[PDB]
Structures are given as C-alpha cells and as structure tokens.
C-alpha cells in the first residue's frame, strides 16, 4: 500500500485535452498537502508549516488564497491514474491534473478504451509521483498523449469510438 494516493468515481470530461484529467479539489489538497504547506509558507498565508497544517485541519478554517496556492503547487506536474484490474501497461497513465469542483475524477474519453473503463460506476486511483525523476519518467514515457499505439499490435489504442465515430460518420 502507498502514501500520497486517493481514489474516486470516474466521470466523463470531454473538455479535457488528451493529456489532462479532472482531479477534485479536496483530493488534490490532501494529495499535495506537503507541497501546499511549503507554498503556504512561501507566501503570507501562514507563518510556518505547523501553522498552515493546523489551519488546514478543520474545514471551516480553509479560505480562498489556499486554493490559488494549490493551483501554483500542481502546475506542470502530472498524476497517475490507475484502474484495476491492470492488465497491460496502459492501465496506468499520466495526466496533468485540473482542479474540479465536486468529488469525482474526470477521465478523458479517448483513453477509456485502454483502461476498459466506462462510467457505470467505475472508480480509479490517483498516485502523486514525488521526485523530479519520478515526475520526468511520468511526463515523458507514461503520459497518455505520448502513448498512442498498442505495445501489443502496433495499431492505435486511443482512437475514436462510440459518439465520435457516430458524429463523423453522420
């Protein structure tokens, strides 16, 4: 089992670019919590680390600048989304997270086929790669938009299906 990791129900978000995904605000706050303490001390939001953590302990103690600080924390970084069962390497992919209201993780439509996820209640787990090395591996080799072909057959994996095919055919 591992630290820095969450899970929620997936929901379709077609507004996302291929390399993106919708990560709930509360989820992201708890996942990046140390980075957010650091960025909070890097601005005027808190005196120090412990003051910031005690500040974030209760939900009514949480204000507006903190979400902007969090926005600044996650910039450029990618999370890992994983859907069990993990049958081949594209069961885990890297996305730049985009903070969203609500409690649901928003998945990009094209990658669905590779996760074998629909939206009839499926869930997914989020993992926050920590080091600079980890992040680099994720953004180069593990990014969804970098993996466009099946390591199995060679043919495309992210590719139009359902509504998309329908619209273009029509």
């Amino acid at each position: 089992r591992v630290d820095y990791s969450g899970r929620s129900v997936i929901v379709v978000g077609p507004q996302l670019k291929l390399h993106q995904c919708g990560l709930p605000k509360r989820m992201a706050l708890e996942l990046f919590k140390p980075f957010l303490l650091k960025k909070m001390e890097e601005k005027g939001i808190a005196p120090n680390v412990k003051a910031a953590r005690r500040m974030l302990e209760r939900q009514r103690d949480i204000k507006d600048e903190v979400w902007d600080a969090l926005e600044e924390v996650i910039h450029g970084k990618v999370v890992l989304l994983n859907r069990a069962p993990t049958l081949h390497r594209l069961g885990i992919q890297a996305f730049q997270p985009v903070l969203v209201e609500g409690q649901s993780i928003q998945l990009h439509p094209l990658v669905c086929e590779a996760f074998n996820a629909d939206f009839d209640g499926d869930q997914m787990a989020v993992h926050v790669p920590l080091s600079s090395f980890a992040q680099a591996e994720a953004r180069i080799q593990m990014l969804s938009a970098h993996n466009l072909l099946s390591p199995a057959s060679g043919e495309p994996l992210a590719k139009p299906s359902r509504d998309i095919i329908l619209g273009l055919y029509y």
Binding site: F133, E137, Q141, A152, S153, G154, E155
Partner: protein, 147 residues
C-alpha cells in the same frame, strides 16, 4: 487469438517460447563435472562447451529441453524470483542447501529488495548519463586546462 479477433504480434509469443526452450538435458558429460540427465541452461552449457573445446577436451553432449512456463519460471537461477512465485518451501530449501547466490539480474529480485530495476531509466545503458550547460562545461574545461 486470431479466432477471437485479437491482433497480437508474434514477437511476444516468441519471447515466451524462448523462455520455454531455455533449458537442456545432458546425454553425455564428456570431460565435464556434469552428469547424465542433469538439466541446465543452454547458455551456461554453451559457455562450458566453448571453454572445454578451448581446452582441447571433450565437449558435453546435450539435448534440447522444452518445459512449460511454470516449471521454467521455478527453474530460474535467481532464487528470490523462484521463491516469490510458487512452491516457496521447495525453492527455498533447494537454494539454502545449494548455498545459492542471487545476482539480482531480474526485475523481481530488485523489486523485492526495493532497488532500482535494471530497466528503463534504470538501465545500465542510460542511467550513467551526465548533463551540463556550455558555461559550466567551459569553466571546467579551463580548470582542466590549468593543471
């Protein structure tokens, strides 16, 4: 797989079948310490045979051996891999009696120990790469030009 309309490159299938023909059974030990029937890797028996021919000795007569994935997996060299698969007690006794060493060649071993796997960013081929800008590279070039 074709039957079910699954496109799947022969490559992978050949990698596995390759792991299936990994082993051989001696039919005549020749001038070796080996034994008639004793099973070993085709690689190791070819190295021994080349060392024995290089010594002007009799090479080892051996037979190609096919074995299915499970046996072939348990039959690995690295006992840390074999133990974490199946028939743990068997593997572990065999190894402890043999006083076996695991060279941490595979991924499984390193995964268990929590090392950096010998793969991808962890390949000995690429991990030793260095990076430097032209400014620092020239400053260091001046330091090397000094001495």
């Amino acid at each position: 797989y074709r039957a079910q309309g699954v496109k799947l490159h022969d490559k992978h299938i050949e990698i596995v079948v390759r792991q299936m023909m990994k082993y051989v059974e001696v039919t005549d030990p020749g001038d070796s310490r080996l034994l008639e029937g004793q099973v070993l890797e085709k690689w190791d028996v070819e190295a021994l045979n080349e060392r024995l021919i290089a010594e002007g000795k009799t090479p080892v007569a051996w037979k190609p051996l096919l074995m299915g994935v499970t046996k072939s997996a348990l039959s690995t060299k690295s006992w840390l891999s074999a133990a974490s698969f199946q028939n743990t007690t068997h593997v572990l006794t065999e190894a402890a009696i043999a006083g076996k060493k695991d060279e941490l060649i595979g991924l499984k071993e390193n995964v268990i120990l929590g090392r950096l796997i010998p793969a991808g960013t962890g390949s000995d081929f690429v991990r030793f790469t260095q990076v430097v800008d032209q400014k620092t590279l020239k400053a260091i070039e001046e330091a090397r030009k000094e001495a």
